[PDB]
Write a protein that binds this ligand. Sequence first.
Ligand SMILES: CCCOC(=O)c1ccc(O)cc1
Length: 481
Amino acid sequence: TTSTVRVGFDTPQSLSPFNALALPDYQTARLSYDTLVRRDAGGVVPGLAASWTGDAAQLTFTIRDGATCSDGTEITPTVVADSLSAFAKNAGPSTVVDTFGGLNPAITADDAAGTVMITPEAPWADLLAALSVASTGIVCPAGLANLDGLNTGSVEGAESGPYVLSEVEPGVRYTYELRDDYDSWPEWETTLEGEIPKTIEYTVVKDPSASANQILSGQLDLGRIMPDSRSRFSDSQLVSNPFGNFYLVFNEREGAVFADEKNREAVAQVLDRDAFDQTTTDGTGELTDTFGSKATQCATAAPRPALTALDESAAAETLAGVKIRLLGAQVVGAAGAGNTYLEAALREAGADVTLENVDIGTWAGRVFGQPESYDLTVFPDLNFTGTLTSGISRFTGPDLLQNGGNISGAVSETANALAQQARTATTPEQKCAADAEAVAALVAEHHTVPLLVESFIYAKRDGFSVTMLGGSLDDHLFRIT
Ligand SMILES: CCCOC(=O)c1ccc(O)cc1
């Protein structure tokens, strides 16, 4: 009969919702701050917002009663509108356009009406879903006063969420303590067996072998496992959820090697999606030819992209002596094994390849902070909105360098146009038609290769559960049995 759960996870690159880029950022943001809506089967359930009304042009949220910060401040529309305003101006340009379709939403409170009104500068369907993501969590006025404070840990009175980070050992352990004065839980349709933990010790594991060993020796209760480690556990200690959707991102900027489309195609010709799946997921994942799974909106709509066939001969002629800075996330298979496979397939095509296999936190700083610092990566996307928009955004609009969402610096006139008619779309069908065509275009012009959807495998000790509701990625519901 304990009240403490010890969860394995990767090192955060920030504890501030505004600077969140990597899963560990969202995992911590999830405990400390409440979002307006939360994920569940068939869509989104009321969280800090009791209900909402609106289109893709504009949503109005009505804030719930009895909602309160870790200092006591009543959570009013002014607090919420201030938090979402602070987010829109302080967060990464990437995550802001992903949320509001742009950098300049209209956000306004009305403490009388009890409403918060958001008005995308152009219509944005992804807004409602985007506000279920941990990084949109409400920062109370204590947090807005000190943004440098939120990066590194708890600023007193900032938390809108059920926990406060009471103890910190940077890059080692983040100890979260449940607060006595919180009953503002979301309106979950789903019913969860077991007790909300009083104390959550978010424990940094350096690698998957370590993760497994510490479940098994009882240093951890819950932790992520690499597919090879499955056989070490009974089926009943495992909880398997579809997670990241993996696709290539090239540095396409004028002067870089993958500016030239003929180089991008050569990479496509050298990557066996079967071999890549075997090395990355060992068949626990699923191939996908788009920016999601079959559960992703529009992901089965026409057309299906025409992937480049393997041509290792044609790739050898093209990539001979070509210098490729391959950036790797260590989540892309055990210890970044998928990145290793990709390097190896480029090496045997005669490319001069240098792979940097880094932790998810370091990877995320590099991709979103210094986009010119690499040529190619396997991008493990977290499709938070459950649409194809997540992935299309990464290749269209203004560059990241110009405060856009365009990670790769790719200029696809077709894909850019199809992104815009997705916004002007009268019906869901036209929207899907636009989105599916945008992905097909991007695949045809060798702007990406869609790879797979991975499985997030939690291994857990007796007495401990963990649930992911409505295809959620950053809302791991820990329970003590
Ligand atoms: C896509 C944004 C950063 O990605 C992650 O933090 C991530 C993605 C997939 C995973 O399985 C783990 C982390």
